[PDB]
Write a protein that binds this DNA or RNA. Structure first.
Lengths: 336, 107, 336, 108, 107
DNA sequence: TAAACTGTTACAACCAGTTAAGGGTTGGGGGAAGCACTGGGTCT
RNA sequence: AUUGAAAGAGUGCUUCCCCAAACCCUUAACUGGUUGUAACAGUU
């Protein structure tokens, strides 16, 4: 089922999704140009951010973590166990399976039915040319527009040095001729009131893209290949994989940095039918825009439920109040 | 024009001989995406200036030359005049780019 | 019927429509030259751009998504469910049917009746030579000229490295000699006040271009080869396909970019007869031009309806200020 | 006048074989830069990856990697600052990118 | 002069033995009304050259070699004085033509 | 009733290690490539 | 004003239409600016 959860978080001293030193100790983090008004024209300013690839990979990590506990997690890629983001990266032939079998890149529907890792995040098997668009279109992580407007500066990035001190069997720091292992590096750590918007098209997970339906007697049902129980378990695990995202299990340098997170304002929409996606948290009128789109979609007619985290939003809206993220996804999966 | 002297001193930080390296300050003054950390790194270089002077007059090299005050205030006026991040980043990178050049300081 | 939409949308952190620069890993976004005066003559500057072909593909995606829910969604291409816009590719003398059969090419009316994709988005079969110009016209999503005035460039683009990390079954990263797939592909992400404009000529759906009018008694009458209910359903589905085109679904690499994609300002006009197309949002100032166009068209004798959002459109121009794009499509489908 | 050969030498040393340090991100940044700021950042990063090349050359016995002359930096600054036209700026950046790939006198 | 080697090292992209077929780069080099875009095309060729070398040494065929520096010097000193577009088009088309030729790649 | 004298402005190690810098898949399909209008001789 | 006087290769033609450089892809990972050093001695 289609679920779109957007909102804002607060970050302090995070080195998430660095660009990398590229031989330099000053580890570049990812930057992005953003438009702000500042009452003198919407000029573009460079601000720290992390890509949607970060959120996609960490959603995959939560996916495999939750399948490590579900009884139906046996059908998973052995690469997926080690948080390996690669999905058929090289032009291989027979993919290894954690169960102890192998997968052949033929009859894509068979891979969809059997393998569960490449059902929501897609795959790009390059030798057989079998591709599948993913169903987790993760967004970027950018601050609030008025935040940058009202700071008119105060770079959200700080440079902090670190060193890997050498001590040897003789108790010394080897300079050149007895071990040149002592090393320093400067890392960039960022902060700010960032926003995110995760769209999740779980409605056709487990449905091969080649033949989503059959229409044998003109009926509106998808061409399912797996039993409904396993599909529902996969949907629940994929949606619960969003729980560690909104708590501090995303970004790079998760061991050394481990960014601090919070729940400030979250708006979530959930429905079986196709619904418009919300706006990535970057602006000030995003709450108003979300309220407008929800009320207009309800006017059109949709079986869509809205979950709000202590936000004003507005009146004449049947949105349900939420208090955290795991209870939010529990309420989302409350029906089967 | 007014980049040679300060760029010369910037290259005095890391060059042949001069067994003391400081690339964090160069990196900070190069990618000065905001209005500051540029003058911060330049001041850090100016604070290591006595260290460079002592090392030069001690080991093998002629004493280093501090950038002229007119150069410093020319840089300050240039960074005051600019407002867009484009000019600030261009000035910062052009300033810190001279730190890596073939200079025959110590004969 | 005929509806022309235009406006200005603020985008950030998007790698939408990236060419890739050939087989190299440095994926670069589409860039097109535009003319901006900058008070020194209309100088040419290369700016990030979005092809209208992508808009056509995403309109196809929205159309099939909203036609799936319709009770008459069976009459669709097999590749429509596949989210594949390829209609009558190389060496294709037949049409793939979603029911599991084939359609022979004998007449354009039969093609449009059996396959709504060729009816709306057009088709081209080289084997038979049959041609049909699409009813959907898409323009390049270009940043506002006034935006270029107020930012004076700044390259509008950030470069982000996206190292694909691979771990072998043993647990080694590998040096490409063990079959591992490690790789560095870099991507370009843009921003700015882009301008969008789409023309939707929903007056030929179910009306073949070979003989759009029959002239039974020397009178104008569309040659609707389909039932009126099917034509109305196609109208509604195509008009509702604009909702993902404006909410969150646009461009390429949506799985890893998913920009904010909010509507800063929007104008749209609808009529049962031919109407002038809206001016793009690329220009620094087009509100007065749009006001003049609308008022002069209304004075000419055109019964057009105008819907605006975040644009005053003067005082004597009548227009219902919609709150979102969903309200716009509701007004577009309210008159049937 | 003079910057061509030295820039080619240094960029080749940054990109050529017998180093196992193939940094193409800097080359791509130098090439694809409509504005001058990113070209300057790319060339600055290329110049910054000098100590790695020197240390590797000393370790493996390769000849030391020559650093471009200060007059070359002078000419670079003059032609970047004096040419506000993006056309000539792109031409210079792509010329530098071309000189990033050259088969000069490598290690014997 | 200096056309033989550049044509030989540019023809590797479209050569049959390399299953990448960079037709786009040669297309961009071929009909280039301005010097900057043909320079970008040959830069893309040189950027894909390491991939061709890697695939050649993986397959077993002799690896391609980077064009000689004197070739680049000649190209740079000839491209500057392309005041008339006709000579620039002539050079671009000549490079494209020499990008389509038979070469002894895999014996 | 007097208003800091002075040695000292960090040393030293280190200034990215490695791994890959596209993998793949396709390089115009397919129709036509002038439709007439203007005839130049040799005979009666 | 001339082997020249009169003198339309000219008159209609959407190179067209259809087509997502598209899809999957955590510079990632591990790594303390670390360790020692009285603003000290002495002052009507």
């Amino acid at each position: 089922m289609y679920v779109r959860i957007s909102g804002r978080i607060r970050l302090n001293a995070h080195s998430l999704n660095a660009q990398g030193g590229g031989g330099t100790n000053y580890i570049e983090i990812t930057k992005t140009k953003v438009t702000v008004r500042t009452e003198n024209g919407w000029t573009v300013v460079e601000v720290p951010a992390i890509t949607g690839n970060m959120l996609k990979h960490w959603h995959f990590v939560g996916f495999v973590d939750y399948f490590k506990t579900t009884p139906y997690g046996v059908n998973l890629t052995e690469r997926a166990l080690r948080y390996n983001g690669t999905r058929f990266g090289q032009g291989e032939t027979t993919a290894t399976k954690a169960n102890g079998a192998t997968v052949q890149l033929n009859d894509e529907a068979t891979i969809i039915k059997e393998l569960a890792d490449a059902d929501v995040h897609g795959f790009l098997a390059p030798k057989t040319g079998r591709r599948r668009v993913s169903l987790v279109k993760a967004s970027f992580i950018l601050p609030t527009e008025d935040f940058i407007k009202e700071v008119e500066g105060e770079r959200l990035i700080t440079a902090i040095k670190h060193n890997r001190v050498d001590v040897d069997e003789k108790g010394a720091i080897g300079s050149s001729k007895e071990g040149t292992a002592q090393m320093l590096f400067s890392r960039e750590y960022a902060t700010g009131l960032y926003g995110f918007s995760i769209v999740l098209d779980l409605g056709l997970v487990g449905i091969p893209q080649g033949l989503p339906v059959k229409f044998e007697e003109n009926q509106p049902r998808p061409n399912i290949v797996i039993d409904p129980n396993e599909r529902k378990a996969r949907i629940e695990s994929a949606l619960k994989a969003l729980i560690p995202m909104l708590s501090g299990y995303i970004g790079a340098n998760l061991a050394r940095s481990f960014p601090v997170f919070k729940v400030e304002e979250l708006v979530a929409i959930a429905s079986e039918g196709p619904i418009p996606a919300l706006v990535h948290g970057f602006y000030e009128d995003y709450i108003e825009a979300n309220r407008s789109i929800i009320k207009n979609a309800r006017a059109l007619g949709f079986n869509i439920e809205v979950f709000t985290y202590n936000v004003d939003l507005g009146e004449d809206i049947e949105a349900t109040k939420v208090s955290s993220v795991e209870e939010l996804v529990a309420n989302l999966v409350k029906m089967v | 024009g007014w980049i040679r002297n300060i760029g010369r001193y910037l290259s005095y930080l890391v060059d042949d001989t001069f067994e003391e390296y400081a690339y964090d300050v160069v990196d900070g003054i190069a990618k000065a995406r905001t209005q500051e950390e540029l003058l911060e790194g330049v001041y850090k270089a100016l604070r290591l200036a006595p260290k460079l002077k002592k090392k030069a007059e001690s080991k093998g090299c002629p004493p280093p030359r501090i950038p002229s005050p007119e150069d410093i205030e020319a840089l300050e006026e240039k960074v005051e005049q600019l407002s867009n991040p484009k000019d600030l980043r261009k000035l910062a990178v052009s300033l810190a780019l001279w730190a890596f050049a073939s200079w025959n300081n110590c004969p």
